Design a protein around this ligand. Structure first.
Ligand SMILES: *[C@@H]1O[C@H](CO)[C@@H](O[C@@H]2O[C@H](CO)[C@@H](O)[C@H](O)[C@H]2NC(C)=O)[C@H](O)[C@H]1NC(C)=O
Ligand SMILES: *[C@@H]1O[C@H](CO)[C@@H](O[C@@H]2O[C@H](CO)[C@@H](O)[C@H](O)[C@H]2NC(C)=O)[C@H](O)[C@H]1NC(C)=O
Lengths: 397, 397, 397, 397, 397
């Protein structure tokens, strides 16, 4: 024939084709759409809004009973490319859609002589799923993509898998693995959904399992916390008499509060439940408050010298003997002169006695400060070891 | 017939069909559109802009008097799928629209032999409603969706419900319940709206009632507040003489002010009215200011020792007797020597008297500090109990 | 006739209709477009960018001389609905456009037998206007919407009002009154604009007058300011000798500076002129600086005791008499003993004299501190009363 | 003729017209497009991304040799409106495009009997240019708009100006002058651009010169700076012995650092070069650091009294004579008594000598503090005067 | 011929042309698309999301075997412009697409008599690549653009380069060089990609190498750091007895922590690895912590005077001899009088001895403070020199 083979075949196919008619000679035969999903990247995970944005390479093929031809009559053409906007295309969508992502339009599809139509197209899908951040930053999310025909029931359109389920499960060839999220697998699952008495719908659920990389968050959260805790430990060495100890502790607490406020404003959160990491921040705040309370108690005990109250005997024993051991620690004119110089005696006696009372109070305060510093340091060490053990469990288990 | 049944039926229907003509043989008969609304998710609630963004699964069916056929003449076809862009579609819109949401296009609709046309399509609707945050974070919003034909009057297009009102009221099958907002119900209501003398319009109002989950806000707001209040309580134990008490209190107040500024910058607000939660922040600020004023008063009273003024007798009685009980608390040369050593007497007398005056002032200040600390602690406890009772009322009522 | 009346009428009208031809039999006759504007909501007012975003319900009608028919020939059809995309539509736009808002498309328009065409459509219009914030937060903005035919001159398209000007002026039926902005009126005004010698253009200017609700801003700005001013007033009671007064004042000033920086970063501003509210912040900062300067002066005066300089007589009189009244306030060995004990006399004399000089300086400083505190309190009260009077004028005038 | 003149003319013109053919009878004749640009507003200037967003009223006219008619044959019609989407339109674009702005579509164009086609359309153009902020906030930007035919070479499409260059240069009729940027002029310039051997392209470059209004930035930057500098000046009056001077200075420096960090986070910047205004901030920081260093030096000099080191004679002379002038400032028992009371002599001697050494050190420190305060105040005054002179030069030159 | 040459040629070409058929007479012959890429600007580099946004001037040409004509039959027309939407266009896309950028549409393409079709069009491409910020701010990114036919295999569409690889490699004519990123080169590379047994795909990978300009980041990060380090150095001069040293150091540390938090919130970061610049911030924080620990140790050593413990002999030797050298530093009544005045002796003895013990402790503390200040200054100088050497290596290597 004079005309080119491709042109003649396209004229033979599309001159009598109806775009709005489902391609089945017998209307009782459903149109089976075999789909495949390849996850490319996790563009954004919005735990606040429970919205997942991901980019996939979606492809589907079905049988077009009207687009069939004999290759021998068209120069042995067995495969042909036809515009997408000139043939019937199933209305396969995702139930979890909450927004329309902007994706490039694929103008052509492949068609084979026996009727198979191959449609490859990438999709930016904005889907809402359950983003539980209880184990944040070690959370593993399980978001599902439910591909289903929005209108046509299973008696018209049914859905199946292009490849074997195992291959889809472990398909990670083109995934952007350098991002915050690691793709564990894509689990397919078929279900015949229904709400009406006979309106049964075909669904293919792809469970996109993604695991967060916690090292960035672990650093950005722990490092300031351990720095402030170390500074708190160092602050104990300041003598209680200097007075700068209270200012140091309160300034450190203010800095920690500012840091925690910033962290809360920056970290993700969900209204249904708070992450477990927030408990550790509360524990650190409690430790800092305990340190400041101990500092205030020691300061008050030292200033009790201003009470002019001799140290009780029982406290003396308890602190300086038990705890200290535990811590490994003209005659008439002359007689008038005598009487007055004894008044001087009595006044200097009183001043020296006040000084010695302050001495005793200060010694007791220092001993108790050493004891409480040791106790607080041991508690902090135990808490740090417990946290490290939890991290090791999450790391190696 | 040689041609496929679906192709022949589509040709028989759409070859003479006019897309821009309302499908009624008699123009006096209105076209009744039975709609249904299923709320899927509350994407965003903007109290600042009074804008609500939600995703719904909207579906409507009407009768197309031109798209009727006899099944026996088309291989017993009783249901057919036809492209949406090839048939008349009512211009049902929402009055509350302030923006166009991006929603996937459904290319096909279902058509039955007797003329019924079924159109399923999801809609991201950006609607403006009254978001009163007076009871924030326990606010229950009542936003209405008014589906109405923008142009056609009731003499042309009328609207009704697909399902019974009760089923629509309690339809929560696919709602995303893990979000910040909980769906209480969707109340439908029909109204024949009108502004002109004869331009009566059909309206179907769906009242989307959503309740906020307050636990997240409750925690994020109370926990810093109770932490700072506890720190304020601890600060009372600092002795007034140390001087660090004033610095502690002012630093705590500065931290609370910064926290409140951040909270205001982060919490939602409306220009028509402030939330009731802002009163509790003002109460906490007043409590902190009262604490600082008491600290300043005690500091001034203690420093009154620098006034060299003996304590008044009435104040002495009132504080050290009533309140304290309530709180369960060569001759000529020798005579010259005598005269001078008595001058020494008088100077040490004066110094000791000054010290004793300071003693009395300090004792009075300490007693009053204990009293005011007890009073402030009782007031704080009462306020906390009242707040807890209010929360319990909001929780169990 | 066998065919339906609506179908026959649509065929009779649109089969010979040209969409791109202005509908006038005589080209010398202009096409008069009667428009109407109903403001629905003020979505956003951007004082920084001088951009106004509002949602309106715009509707226009004109006469289509080609779309005329005799009702008696079409089953007494006097009103018909025709797709918008099948008839000529005027290119009415707003000159103030700076952006294209996304608005739902209305597919149908109403047509009557005598030629009138009714087009209802909502519009999200992003327009630039003069947003003067001089009276912020009590500013009343006056933004104009100039509807005009972009291309056609007045010899082709002319514009008029659908309703009477009074009704348009007071049309507030569907306005969202719960927002930050209150709609005072929509004033229409017609003008025959021109730039060329004969290119006269029809314009219809709608002056959208909106008034801001200041209560939210009034609270969010005054409450921190009055709180900090009250704290400054309380700080005067701290004795100058404690030394904590300077730290208190400087910390308060730092907090106020941080608050003012945040307020400036959050409040709207224009490069052409600053709001009058900024003057009051400067006044408050000046008051705080004056308070700190007075505190520093009193501290220096008290520490002048370290100068070992007796108080000048004139200052003594002025402060302790005038101002205080205003404020309602072996012989040789024995003689050697005598000589030395008189050396002791002289040393204790000097120490006591130094103490008394410090006494006098402290008394003078305290009296002057009381005076300056009274003066500053009176000035603050006067400023607050003036501000309250200004607010009352803005409220009741 | 029975048909309307406009309808008949449109049928005569557009029935044989090809939309995709350049309108020239002789293909060797280029199509000359006369353009005009009117700047309406400067929507956004992004110095960070080097992106300029502006709104212009662009209009162009060319000759359509196929759309010609004799007015006498069509009821003396000399001007006609035709849809834009039905005639050939040149592909004039801007080379500097980096984004597509959303602009309203103009559906109609004017056509005259001799072939001229007038196309008016507004354009929101997002263009990238060189935004040098070296003279910020007094920077004058010079951004170019290069209108050129993307595909057609000069042998097909050539570009010229609608109006005279002078009129375009001074066209400021509709510019929004209330914004941050002031339009100085729009300079046109034609160039025959080329890269290949014969692919010469016509370009029309419009140089949009815009000048920033600096008053807002000048205030928002200077006022905090001068306030903090004044506070630093006041801080010198605090006596060095009080100890609050160091806390005051360090708190002021912390506040200035926070302010500078916020300013840097808010002010625009470019990676190619920093603005000159940053030098003045560095100078202010250096001044504050010098003030704090002087305060620390004076504090150390005063505390040298704790060194028990008498003031060197040379320092005494230099400070208290030169600089001070510049600043305008039983026998055995009795002998035992004698020996011991002389031991008392020696101890009180030592205490008084220590006090006098502290006296001398304090006097020297006070004199040097006065000197350095005068020097620092003079330096600050000189810097402020220099800055004011620079501002006056930028204002009046 | 009467008709215009261009019109006649367009009619001859496009009247029988099929838009959806690949232009090859023999379907076995692949369509070779020669592409070219010119990078215009780097709009945005998102290290957080691993997304690159760039603007390129993409152009491709291929052979259209159906659009061929003899110039002599059409008035010697050798080149023609035809609308893009009227001819077959290959579906060349970028694999790395994650979003659709908005780019102007080019309506026309050039066609030559022998069949070559030239298509010029700009593209805003949003592509995901590996943005390693390990060497930040001196990082050199290597992002690839893989142009490939999405559907057609290599047996249908193959891709080649328009120009020589060297010219494409060094094409920087129109690049916006004033931005944050500098373009080093664009390296092309061809690959026959494949996943199936016979589905081989043609790919052309352009490696866009961009280098960041670090001067802005270098300044904005170092200048605050060096300022705070200098302030820390100055703080050592404060005497330990003043007590303001601890407050100064803790305030400086708080300021540095706030600065570091802001820097972290502003600087880019990746979850796969932290930048090396973060180590230097940790080193600076460690230096500040060491300085504060030294200050606390010196303060405690000085306050040890409150321990009433004479300085150990070994410490005395070590500090005041070795280190100091290294640093280049009636009888009965009279006898009663005697006994009591000797009691006075003993009390003043004790007071003076306490004073001398404090003297010794203070001298030791001052000497050790000088030593540790010298050591810390030397360490800081060494660290600064090492950092400067690293910068010089990065600058000149
Ligand atoms: C428009 O439709 C509504 C809903 O079907 C009609 O309202 C119903 O009218 C019937 C008959 O009068 C009543 O029995 C129902 O109780 C009504 N339902 C409701 C919810 O009001 C309405 O009459 C229709 N109007 C027109 C003009 O057709
Ligand atoms: C364009 O329309 C306006 C509005 O209808 C016309 O203005 C009116 O003109 C009539 C007759 O001259 C007056 O009686 C009215 O008072 C005018 N109204 C206003 C608001 O000005 C205007 O004349 C029309 N112009 C043309 C050229 O048709």
């Amino acid at each position: 024939t004079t005309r080119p083979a491709l042109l003649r075949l396209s004229d033979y196919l599309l001159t009598n084709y109806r775009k709005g008619v489902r391609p089945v000679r017998d209307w009782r035969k459903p149109t089976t759409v075999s789909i495949d999903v390849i996850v490319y990247a996790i563009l954004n995970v919005d735990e606040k809004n429970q919205v997942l944005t991901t980019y996939i390479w979606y492809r589907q093929y079905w049988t077009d009973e009207f687009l069939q031809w004999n290759p021998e009559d068209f120069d042995n053409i067995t495969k042909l490319s036809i515009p997408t906007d000139s043939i019937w295309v199933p209305d396969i969508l995702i139930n979890e859609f909450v927004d329309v992502g902007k994706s490039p339009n694929i103008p052509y599809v492949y068609i084979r002589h026996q009727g198979e139509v191959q449609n490859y197209k990438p999709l930016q899908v904005v889907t809402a799923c359950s983003l539980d951040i209880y184990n944040f930053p070690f959370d593993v999310q399980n978001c599902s993509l439910t591909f289903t025909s929005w209108l046509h029931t299973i008696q018209d359109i049914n859905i199946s898998l292009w490849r074997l389920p195992e291959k889809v499960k472990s398909d990670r060839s083109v995934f952007m693995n350098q991002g915050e999220w690691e793709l564990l697998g894509v689990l397919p699952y078929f279900r015949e959904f229904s709400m009406e008495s006979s309106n049964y719908y075909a669904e293919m659920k792809f469970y996109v399992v993604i695991r967060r990389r916690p090292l960035f968050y672990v650093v950005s959260l722990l490092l300031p916390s351990i720095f402030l805790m170390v500074m708190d430990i160092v602050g104990f060495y300041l003598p209680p008499n200097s007075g700068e100890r209270v200012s140091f502790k309160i300034t450190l607490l203010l800095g920690y509060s500012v840091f925690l406020i910033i962290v809360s404003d920056t970290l993700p959160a969900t209204a249904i439940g708070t992450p477990l990491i927030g408990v550790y921040f509360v524990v650190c705040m409690a430790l800092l408050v305990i340190s400041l309370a101990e500092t205030i108690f020691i300061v008050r005990l030292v200033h009790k010298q201003d009470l002019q109250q001799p140290v009780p005997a029982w406290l003396r024993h308890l602190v300086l003997e038990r705890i200290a051991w535990l811590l490994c620690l003209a005659s008439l004119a002359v007689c008038g002169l005598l009487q007055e110089l004894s008044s001087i005696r009595q006044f200097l006696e009183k001043r020296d006695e006040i000084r010695e009372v302050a001495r005793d109070w200060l010694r007791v305060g220092s001993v108790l400060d050493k004891l409480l510093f040791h106790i607080y340091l041991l508690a902090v060490l135990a808490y740090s070891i417990t946290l490290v053990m939890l991290w090791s469990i999450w790391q190696y288990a």
